[PDB]
Amino acid sequence: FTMKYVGSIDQGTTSTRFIIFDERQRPVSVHQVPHTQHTPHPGWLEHDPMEIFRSACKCMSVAIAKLRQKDASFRKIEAIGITNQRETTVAWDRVTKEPLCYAPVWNDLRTYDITKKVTAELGGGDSMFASKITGLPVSTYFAAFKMRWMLENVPAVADACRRGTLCFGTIDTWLMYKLSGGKAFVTDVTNASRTFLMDLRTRKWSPELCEKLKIPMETLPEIRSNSELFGYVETDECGVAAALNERTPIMGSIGDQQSALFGNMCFEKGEAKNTYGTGCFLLMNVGEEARFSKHGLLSTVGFQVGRDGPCYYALEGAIACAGATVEWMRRNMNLFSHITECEKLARSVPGTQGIVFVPAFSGLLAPYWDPSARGTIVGMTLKTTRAHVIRAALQAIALQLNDVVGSMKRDAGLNLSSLRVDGGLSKNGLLMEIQASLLGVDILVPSMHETTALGAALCAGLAAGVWTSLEEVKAVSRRENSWKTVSPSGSAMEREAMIAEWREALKRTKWAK
Amino acid sequence: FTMKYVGSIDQGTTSTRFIIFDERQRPVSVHQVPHTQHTPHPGWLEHDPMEIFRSACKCMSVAIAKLRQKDASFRKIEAIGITNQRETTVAWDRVTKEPLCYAPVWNDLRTYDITKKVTAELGGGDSMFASKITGLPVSTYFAAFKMRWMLENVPAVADACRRGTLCFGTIDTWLMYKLSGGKAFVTDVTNASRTFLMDLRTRKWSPELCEKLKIPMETLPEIRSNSELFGYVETDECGVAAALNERTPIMGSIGDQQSALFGNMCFEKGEAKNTYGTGCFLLMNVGEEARFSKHGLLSTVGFQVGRDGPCYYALEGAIACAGATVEWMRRNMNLFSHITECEKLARSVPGTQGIVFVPAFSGLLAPYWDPSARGTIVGMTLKTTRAHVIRAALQAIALQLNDVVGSMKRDAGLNLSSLRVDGGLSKNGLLMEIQASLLGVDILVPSMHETTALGAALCAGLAAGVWTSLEEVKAVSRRENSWKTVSPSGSAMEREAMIAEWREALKRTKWAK
Ligand SMILES: Nc1ncnc2c1ncn2[C@@H]1O[C@H](COP(=O)(O)OP(=O)(O)NP(=O)(O)O)[C@@H](O)[C@H]1O
C-alpha cells in the first residue's frame, strides 16, 4: 500500500498547532498560530472562539502546503484527531453558528462566587458532595460553573437558552462543530468528564446534577469515545478543505492531559505520564474500574478506544510551579542566564547539604492543598550557594511528584510501573535522575516529544485503520522513535534523608492571609 | 610648640596595624600586616603568637619611618596603647619566653567538650552559674576554657605548668610581655573581664573559679586599669626600639570593642557603639553601677581610666554581620556583581511585601542564642525579586539590632541615648535609616575611620598627659573629627508591623538535628 498520514489539531491555552504524523508516528509538518488572551478584570481570562477556529484552519492549510511542497508521497490526510485545553467552555448559537460571547478559560476565576454557593447550598458545606459521581470537587475550573455564569451574566446566552438555540461546548465540541459546518454536536468522554455534569460510572450526563446546577440537557452535546467517526471537515475557512483536497473524517478527540497519557503509551494500569511544563500534570492509568481519592486528587477518564469500547480511568494531580520556579530563579533572582545553566549549576554540587527550597509561590496543591503556603527556603549556611538552591528547587519538584504518586498508589491500590515524561523541563537530565531515584522506577523519555499532539493522532489513526491495535502502536513506536530510559540511582540513605527533610520543611511553609 | 604623637597597636583577628595619632586625634601614619588563619580541623581557629608579635613590630617600624618623612622633627612617641582581639589566649614559658603552642582564637569551637562539662559538673544545666561573678555565660569564647583545653591536650603546656613556668595571657598580655622583653606581665580590666576568672564588680581575680576550673593562679597576670604605666618597649624585633629613639612607655591597653566604645566618645550612660568587622557587636555604657542581664546579653567592663579612677560598665550583644550577609548574597548567590547595586536594588522596591529573611547562617545570636537556627526566607511569591530579598536582608540586621537594644533596656534600666556605627557597612545609607527608624534614635557615623585604634591611643594619651581630661578629649574630637548623622523617619504603624512579621518568621528558623 501507499504512505499514510494522520493530522492532529492541538488547541492549547495560548496557541493552536496542527501536526501531521506519518504511519511511523514521525511529526513531518507543523505550524503554530497564537490566539488572543483577553483579561477584562483581574483573575478573568477569555478566548475568542472564532479566532481559535480560524487559527486551527490556518495551521491546517499551512502545514499541509509545507508537507506537499517537501514530500511527494503525501497524497492526503487519512483522518484528523483533536486535542484541547480542557474545561474552557464556549457558548454559541444553533442558528447563527457563532458565539454569544467569549469563552471563559479553564483557570479563569469569575466563577468564584458560584463556587462558594454551590458548596454551601447544594453541598451543605462539603465541596466533595458530588465527587463519587463526577470524580471532581466543586471548583472554578470545571465547565458547568462557567456555563452557569454565562446564563447569570450574559443576556444573549440567557436569551438563547430561552429560545432553544443555545449550545454549550468544551473546545473539542466547538471545534468539531465549526469544522463540520454545524453538522456535529459531539464530545469525547475525557472532555465530558471535566464538566461536573457527567457520571463516571455510566459515562453519561447526570440528570440530577444538571437539574441541581440548572443547566438544561438540550444545551449539551452527545458523549462519544476518544476514537471513532465524529464527522467530516466541510468548511472553507482558510482554504482548509482546498488544502485537504479530498473528504477528510474527524476520527479522534481527546483532552490534552489525557492525550499525553495516550501518546506516551500508558495503556496498562499502573502506567503514568507527567508533563514537566510551567506546572506539572501527572496522570496515572488506574485500569477499568474508577478509583476515588481520599487526598483531593481528581478521578477522571484516561481513555476509551471505540464507541462503548473499554474505558480506562485515571487519577490526576498537579504542582503549580515547576517550570515557573526555574524561570523565577533566572529572571527574578539572577541565579543563572541561559536555561542550560540551571542543570549545569545543579550538577556542580553533589547534594543540597541541608537546605530545602519549597517553591509554593502560589500555594501548595498536590495531596496537601494549602493556599496559605508560600515560597520558603530553610537551612542555609555561609557554605550555601546558588548551585545548592537550584538543585533544591529541582529536588522539590521531584519530591512533590513523589508525594503525589504516593497518594495515587494508595487510592488506586496499585504500584507505579514506570513514568513516561514530556514537557520541556523533561530535557533537564538531573531532574529526571532525581525523580527516578525518589520513585524507585524507570523514567522513560521519548525523543519524539510531541506526545500531546500524538495522542490525538493515534485515536484518529486507530479509528481509521492506519494502526490496527494498541500493541501495533507500541511496536511502531519502539521500532521508529527512540526512548531514553533513566534508571534509579542513589541510595536508600540519600532518599530517606531527602524525604525526611522535605516533611520537616513543609511544616514551616505556612504564611499567608 | 612642637607636635606630640601617640601610637596604637590594633591587633585584630585577621591583621595587626599600628596607627600614630597626633594631638588632633588624627591618624598621621598607619601600617598593616596580616597573619595566618590556621584551621587544623573544622570549627577550629588558631594564631601563631610570634607572627602576631612580629606583625606588630613591623607595623611600628614602618609607621614610624613614614611619619618622619612627613615631620622630620619627630623625635619620639609619647606613649603606646594596645587594643586587641579579646579572648584569644596564648600560652608561653617564662624562661624561653616563647609560645608553647598556637593560640586558640575567640570564635574557635574546640572547647565545646570542656564547655559542656562545666555547664553540668558545676552549672547543673544552668550555664549562667558564675553570671553574678564574671558577667558571662559558659561559652566556647572565654579564656578559661582555652587555658584549660591547652592544659588537658598540649604536652608542652601542661609540662611547663608542672615545671612552674607557664604564663597565660590574652593578646594584650602577650603583646606587653614581648614588647617589654619579658619585664612586664600585666593585663587590663576589659580584657580580664573576658577570661571567666574575674569579678566584674571588684576587678580582681576570683580564686573560687580558678580552683574550680583548675587553672593555677600563678599562670595569670596582674590586673590594672586601661590607662596607666604598664611597661616600656624594650625589644629589637624589627629595630623597633631603635625606631622609637627614646624609651617609650606602654600606657594604654583595652579590648577592641571597649576601645571602639571609648574611641567614639561613649562616656555617658546610655551611649553605645555598633562595630562591624570579623565579629559584629553592640556595646552600651551603663554607668559606674555594674549591670547584669536576664536576656542572654553579656556584662563587662566598659572602661576605667587610671589606677582606680571610676570604672564604667557595659552590656554587650553579638549581631549577625551585615557584611557577611551582603557578601554572601554577592558571591554565593549572585544577586548583584558590585556593592553599589546592593543599595540601588534595596531602594528600587518600596518594601519587602510579605517576605522575611532571617540571615542566621550559623545560629541566632543576639538575645535568642539558638544554635539550631539556620538561614531562612519565608513568604515568597512569583512577584518576589533579588531586590526584595536584599532589602529584607537589611531589615533583618536592623531587626536583630532592635531586639538587642530592646533587650538592653530591660537589663540596664536605661535607653539608647544615641548610636555610633562605623565599619564595613556605613557606606550603606539605607540600612542606617532603617536602623534609626526601628530604634528611634540618632545614628552617628564618624568620618574618622580609625576610632577603635583611637580608643587605646586616648587611654595612653590621658596617662602620659597629651590630653588631661575627658572634656579636652571630647572637645578636640568635636573640633577636629566630623560625623554625618541619620535621623529617625518612620512610625509605630510601620515599626510594630515590621517587628510582627519578624517575630513570626523567627519561629520557622529552627533546623539543626
Ligand atoms: N532544555 C531545557 N532544559 C531544562 N529546562 C528547560 C529547557 N527548556 C525549557 N526548560 C524549562 O522548562 C519549561 C518548559 O516549558 P514548555 O513546556 O516548553 O512551555 P510551557 O509554556 O510551559 N507549556 P505547558 O507544558 O503546556 O505548560 C520552561 O518553563 C523552562 O523554564
Ligand SMILES: Nc1ncnc2c1ncn2[C@@H]1O[C@H](COP(=O)(O)OP(=O)(O)NP(=O)(O)O)[C@@H](O)[C@H]1O
Ligand atoms: N593642622 C595641623 N596642625 C599641626 N600639624 C598638622 C596639621 N595638619 C597636619 N599636621 C601634621 O602634618 C603631618 C602629616 O599628617 P597628615 O595626616 O598627612 O596631614 P594631612 O594630609 O593634612 N591629614 P590630617 O592628619 O587628617 O590633617 C603630621 O605630622 C601631622 O601632625
